[PDB]
Amino acid sequence: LQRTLVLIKPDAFERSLVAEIMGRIEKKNFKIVSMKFWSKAPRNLIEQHYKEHSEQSYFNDLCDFMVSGPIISIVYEGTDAISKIRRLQGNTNPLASAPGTIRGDLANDIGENLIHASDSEDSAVDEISIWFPE
Amino acid sequence: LQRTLVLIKPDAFERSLVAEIMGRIEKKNFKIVSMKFWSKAPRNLIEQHYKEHSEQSYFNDLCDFMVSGPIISIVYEGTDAISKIRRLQGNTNPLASAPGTIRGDLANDIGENLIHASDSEDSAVDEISIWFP
Amino acid sequence: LQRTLVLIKPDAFERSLVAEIMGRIEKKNFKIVSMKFWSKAPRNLIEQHYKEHSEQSYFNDLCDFMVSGPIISIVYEGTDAISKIRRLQGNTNPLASAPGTIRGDLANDIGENLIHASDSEDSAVDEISIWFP
Amino acid sequence: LQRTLVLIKPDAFERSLVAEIMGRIEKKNFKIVSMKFWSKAPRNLIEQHYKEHSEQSYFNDLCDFMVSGPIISIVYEGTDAISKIRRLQGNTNPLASAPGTIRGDLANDIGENLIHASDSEDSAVDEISIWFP
Amino acid sequence: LQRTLVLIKPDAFERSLVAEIMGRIEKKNFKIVSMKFWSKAPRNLIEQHYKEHSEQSYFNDLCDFMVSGPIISIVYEGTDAISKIRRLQGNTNPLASAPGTIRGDLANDIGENLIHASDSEDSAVDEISIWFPE
Amino acid sequence: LQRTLVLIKPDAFERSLVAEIMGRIEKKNFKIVSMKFWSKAPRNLIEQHYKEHSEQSYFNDLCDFMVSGPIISIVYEGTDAISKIRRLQGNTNPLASAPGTIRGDLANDIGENLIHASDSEDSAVDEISIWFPE
Numbered sequence: 001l002q003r004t005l006v007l008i009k010p011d012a013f014e015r016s017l018v019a020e021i022m023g024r025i026e027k028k029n030f031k032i033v034s035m036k037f038w039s040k041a042p043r044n045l046i047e048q049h050y051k052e053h054s055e056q057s058y059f060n061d062l063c064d065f066m067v068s069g070p071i072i073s074i075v076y077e078g079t080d081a082i083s084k085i086r087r088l089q090g091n092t093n094p095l096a097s098a099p100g101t102i103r104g105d106l107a108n109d110i111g112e113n114l115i116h117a118s119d120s121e122d123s124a125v126d127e128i129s130i131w132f133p134e
Numbered sequence: 135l136q137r138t139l140v141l142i143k144p145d146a147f148e149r150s151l152v153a154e155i156m157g158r159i160e161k162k163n164f165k166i167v168s169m170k171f172w173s174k175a176p177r178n179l180i181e182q183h184y185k186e187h188s189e190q191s192y193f194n195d196l197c198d199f200m201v202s203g204p205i206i207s208i209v210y211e212g213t214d215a216i217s218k219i220r221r222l223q224g225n226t227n228p229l230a231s232a233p234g235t236i237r238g239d240l241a242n243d244i245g246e247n248l249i250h251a252s253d254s255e256d257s258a259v260d261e262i263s264i265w266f267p
Numbered sequence: 268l269q270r271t272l273v274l275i276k277p278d279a280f281e282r283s284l285v286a287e288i289m290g291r292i293e294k295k296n297f298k299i300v301s302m303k304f305w306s307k308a309p310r311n312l313i314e315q316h317y318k319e320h321s322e323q324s325y326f327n328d329l330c331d332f333m334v335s336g337p338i339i340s341i342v343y344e345g346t347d348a349i350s351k352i353r354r355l356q357g358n359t360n361p362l363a364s365a366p367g368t369i370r371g372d373l374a375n376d377i378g379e380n381l382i383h384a385s386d387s388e389d390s391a392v393d394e395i396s397i398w399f400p
Numbered sequence: 401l402q403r404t405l406v407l408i409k410p411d412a413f414e415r416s417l418v419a420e421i422m423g424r425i426e427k428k429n430f431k432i433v434s435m436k437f438w439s440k441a442p443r444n445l446i447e448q449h450y451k452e453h454s455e456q457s458y459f460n461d462l463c464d465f466m467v468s469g470p471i472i473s474i475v476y477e478g479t480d481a482i483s484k485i486r487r488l489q490g491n492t493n494p495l496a497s498a499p500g501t502i503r504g505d506l507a508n509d510i511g512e513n514l515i516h517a518s519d520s521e522d523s524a525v526d527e528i529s530i531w532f533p
Numbered sequence: 534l535q536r537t538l539v540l541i542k543p544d545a546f547e548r549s550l551v552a553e554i555m556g557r558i559e560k561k562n563f564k565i566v567s568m569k570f571w572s573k574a575p576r577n578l579i580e581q582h583y584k585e586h587s588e589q590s591y592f593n594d595l596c597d598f599m600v601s602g603p604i605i606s607i608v609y610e611g612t613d614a615i616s617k618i619r620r621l622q623g624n625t626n627p628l629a630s631a632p633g634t635i636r637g638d639l640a641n642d643i644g645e646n647l648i649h650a651s652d653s654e655d656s657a658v659d660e661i662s663i664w665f666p667e
Numbered sequence: 668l669q670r671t672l673v674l675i676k677p678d679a680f681e682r683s684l685v686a687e688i689m690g691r692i693e694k695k696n697f698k699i700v701s702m703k704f705w706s707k708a709p710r711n712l713i714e715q716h717y718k719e720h721s722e723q724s725y726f727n728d729l730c731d732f733m734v735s736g737p738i739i740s741i742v743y744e745g746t747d748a749i750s751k752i753r754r755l756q757g758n759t760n761p762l763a764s765a766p767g768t769i770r771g772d773l774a775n776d777i778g779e780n781l782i783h784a785s786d787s788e789d790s791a792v793d794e795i796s797i798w799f800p801e
């Protein structure tokens with residue numbers, strides 16, 4: 001029984017795909033443990049979530065996009081939640097994300113990709129404590 | 135341009151209809167301005183939310199049901215949000231709720247009806263202050 | 268808590284709308300208690316099912332249509348199943364059937380209307396005994 | 401068996417609701433007989449399409465909106481297409497449009513209402529000749 | 534033109550995914566030849582359907598689950614129906630079943646996996662004769 | 668930013684999957700640049716579109732099927748539109764087209780496969796000029 005951190009990005013709200021994305025996870029039978037809505041995440045919170053990408057050239061545009069609209073932070077719980085939800089998510093690249101996945105079906109840009117999902121146990125614990133410090 | 139208070143009831147979670155419901159409101163172009171997830175709402179918030187029904191026969195069952203599962207409290211914003219979302223919601227009674235409405239399509243019980251929505255400007259103001267103080 | 272008799276008509280199969288129809292009833296929380304697939308219903312079951320229309324002008328076309336493809340007979344159970352599913356069904360006439368109802372959304376002919384549903388306690392009892400003796 | 405004129409408005413494109421709308425009509429069994437995509441409809445076609453509203457207060461905003469994005473003009477054919485598709489469409493006013501209708505479900509503005517549909521035999525004949533001469 | 538045996542398992546009825554599953558097959562354009570509804574399959578009928586798994590450690594739980602609710606037995610017919618419907622079904626394992634498949638989209642357990650589908654010509658003939666002895 | 672040619676084939680209209688197919692592309696966020704409806708494409712226009720398959724044994728049946736009903740020609744525009752829409756389309760073969768793709772989900776025949784999509788830059792330019800000579 002694992003717990004994973006998921007972010008509904010600003011492009012979801014702009015395109016009205018919020019329920020679509022959450023429904024795909026809900027239908028997979030994953031249970032919401034914690035959920036927080038942000039009218040606008042603080043840039044610092046974002047920079048922390050993506051601290052691994054600070055040296056990348058897209059870092060600043062990435063941070064700019066993540067504060068350009070509302071965000072929903074969610075902790076999903078279930079057996080092997082981390083890897084499973086990653087597979088539902090789909091590849092970061094629009095040239096690779098398979099049809100049937102969230103990105104494969106709905107995302108068309110490598111930056112604006114609708115959804116974040118922790119990629120491992122270590123980073124899950126880490127990202128859960130960033131969005132739900134309590 | 136109004137704001138209304140919406141509750142996603144425990145039966146929505148039990149039946150995995152959370153996204154479905156929020157989806158029907160999202161497609162009508164209403165924007166979220168506040169949202170909070172309750173693994174279990176405090177008994178007293180529920181009793182105050184339904185303070186008007188405190189002397190009604192179903193009151194106790196109504197509250198028991200409201201704390202029997204998680205709920206989501208949501209403030210929706212849009213032009214004439216209150217009356218419009220009430221329209222989406224559908225009648226409390228399964229015998230009167232019209233197909234195409236949330237309850238008319240999905241709900242089959244007068245008590246377990248999936249969704250709450252403020253019924254007026256004044257009540258919306260109270261209910262909003264109850265869940266987001 | 269009632270039981271009602273539902274027929275999935277041949278035009279549902281021709282248009283691949285079988286799951287769609289059964290889906291709208293399933294989402295309303297009604298449970299199946301009996302189900303039988305007919306690659307071709309016997310002419311006499313049809314004529315008895317519609318025994319009330321035997322002297323009507325459309326009777327022959329109605330029966331011809333009912334045996335022109337497969338059908339599914341289903342007994343649904345739920346609190347007030349008869350009136351509620353009738354509501355989901357929608358008016359026989361394409362001019363009167365409301366959007367959000369099965370026929371109102373999907374059907375476009377007074378004869379080929381996709382679905383049958385008992386219209387009362389008494390008729391439901393007969394129709395159920397016709398298809399599941 | 402009638403033919404009616406349908407316009408898929410710019411807000412359908414902006415909100416990616418094009419397929420959704422055309423889908424609701426396709427499921428009702430109406431067939432396309434003519435279709436044309438306009439990256440930007442000519443101002444004069446719009447003003448003639450709405451020639452009846454030329455003296456109304458909203459006329460200018462209505463036209464500005466109609467040329468602010470792409471549109472799709474479609475001739476639909478089916479038995480009683482005009483009145484039926486009008487029914488699918490739903491009331492112009494967000495306060496009156498019923499859930500289950502196109503506008504009632506998706507639209508939230510009296511001006512930006514996603515879809516146009518001829519309102520009579522005579523008007524359908526004019527509107528059809530305007531977009532497909 | 535092949536015929537294959539399909540079972541809608543008890544978890545479908547509990548979660549109200551019956552129409553969802555059948556609709557995915559219907560949209561693929563497969564035709565129903567035979568269909569039987571069981572309020573509760575007899576354990577023996579189940580033990581026969583899974584006679585190959587009698588020595589497995591999950592056999593008894595498997596049988597217990599299969600009689601815990603209603604079941605729909607269906608014979609679908611179409612060109613290469615057996616292999617095609619298997620691919621729609623998706624892997625038994627939730628760590629493998631791909632998004633876009635029935636299990637990949639809706640199943641989250643290796644036991645409660647919503648749907649059975651014959652895996653070959655031999656077993657199809659065999660399973661069809663178990664549920665439709667006529 | 669590429670442009671690709673897409674054809675909604677006669678089997679889509681017969682089965683009422685027109686909106687379904689276009690919606691999958693629309694949700695992927697591809698923009699319609701040009702669109703033409705044909706009550707019946709001229710056989711010659713079809714023979715040109717498939718001039719590469721003139722020596723194949725299915726050529727004539729292919730052409731017969733393509734004029735057996737209405738067709739919608741569409742130019743979609745977007746980054747890498749050609750390869751992406753191909754992946755949404757799915758393999759020509761029903762034994763290969765993956766679930767989650769258009770053909771994988773809806774097509775069950777190798778001939779009647781619902782949708783055409785240019786396979787490269789060269790053929791896109793070529794097919795766009797066939798259906799939209801202007």
Ligand SMILES: O=c1ccn([C@H]2C[C@H](O)[C@@H](COP(=O)(O)OP(=O)(O)O)O2)c(=O)[nH]1
Nearest residue numbers: 053058062091092110111113115116117119
């Ligand atoms: O070349 C890239 C790689 C990533 N990102 C953005 C998108 C992604 O959501 C975020 C973090 O990258 P990742 O962790 O590799 O993506 P994922 O979200 O798939 O883990 O950085 C880019 O804009 N360009």
Ligand SMILES: O=c1ccn([C@H]2C[C@H](O)[C@@H](COP(=O)(O)OP(=O)(O)O)O2)c(=O)[nH]1
Nearest residue numbers: 187192196225226244245246247250251253
């Ligand atoms: O006879 C009744 C009436 C209402 N309720 C419950 C359901 C409803 O959600 C809540 C409040 O009732 P309401 O405000 O009259 O209904 P609505 O929620 O439609 O405003 O009380 C019952 O259990 N039994």
Ligand SMILES: O=c1ccn([C@H]2C[C@H](O)[C@@H](COP(=O)(O)OP(=O)(O)O)O2)c(=O)[nH]1
Nearest residue numbers: 320325329358359377378379380383384386
């Ligand atoms: O003018 C008519 C009326 C009815 N029927 C067919 C359609 C209907 O399914 C069946 C039985 O009619 P009904 O019981 O009056 O309609 P419903 O099925 O809505 O109860 O007869 C016609 O073909 N023409």
Ligand SMILES: O=c1ccn([C@H]2C[C@H](O)[C@@H](COP(=O)(O)OP(=O)(O)O)O2)c(=O)[nH]1
Nearest residue numbers: 453458462491492510511512513516517519
């Ligand atoms: O008060 C109004 C009434 C109408 N319109 C626009 C919306 C409508 O699409 C168009 C034509 O109006 P109509 O023909 O009366 O509405 P409908 O489109 O429902 O026939 O004018 C407005 O902007 N404001």
Ligand SMILES: O=c1ccn([C@H]2C[C@H](O)[C@@H](COP(=O)(O)OP(=O)(O)O)O2)c(=O)[nH]1
Nearest residue numbers: 586591595624625643644646648649650652
């Ligand atoms: O490790 C396992 C393997 C299988 N099963 C159950 C699920 C499956 O539905 C049934 C038969 O197994 P299978 O034939 O290998 O699965 P499939 O249904 O994918 O053919 O046994 C388990 O509970 N645990």
Ligand SMILES: O=c1ccn([C@H]2C[C@H](O)[C@@H](COP(=O)(O)OP(=O)(O)O)O2)c(=O)[nH]1
Nearest residue numbers: 720725729758759777778780782783784786
């Ligand atoms: O063995 C075959 C191969 C192809 N075709 C038809 C289907 C296809 O749509 C068309 C062109 O073939 P293709 O370009 O290889 O298919 P695709 O549309 O996947 O590019 O010829 C057949 O009928 N049989």
Ligand SMILES: [Mg+2]
Nearest residue numbers: 117118119123
């Ligand atoms: Mg990562």
Ligand SMILES: [Mg+2]
Nearest residue numbers: 183184186253
């Ligand atoms: Mg109240």
Ligand SMILES: [Mg+2]
Nearest residue numbers: 316317319386
């Ligand atoms: Mg009758």
Ligand SMILES: [Mg+2]
Nearest residue numbers: 449450452519
């Ligand atoms: Mg007008």
Ligand SMILES: [Mg+2]
Nearest residue numbers: 650651652656
């Ligand atoms: Mg097996």
Ligand SMILES: [Mg+2]
Nearest residue numbers: 784785786790
């Ligand atoms: Mg090719």
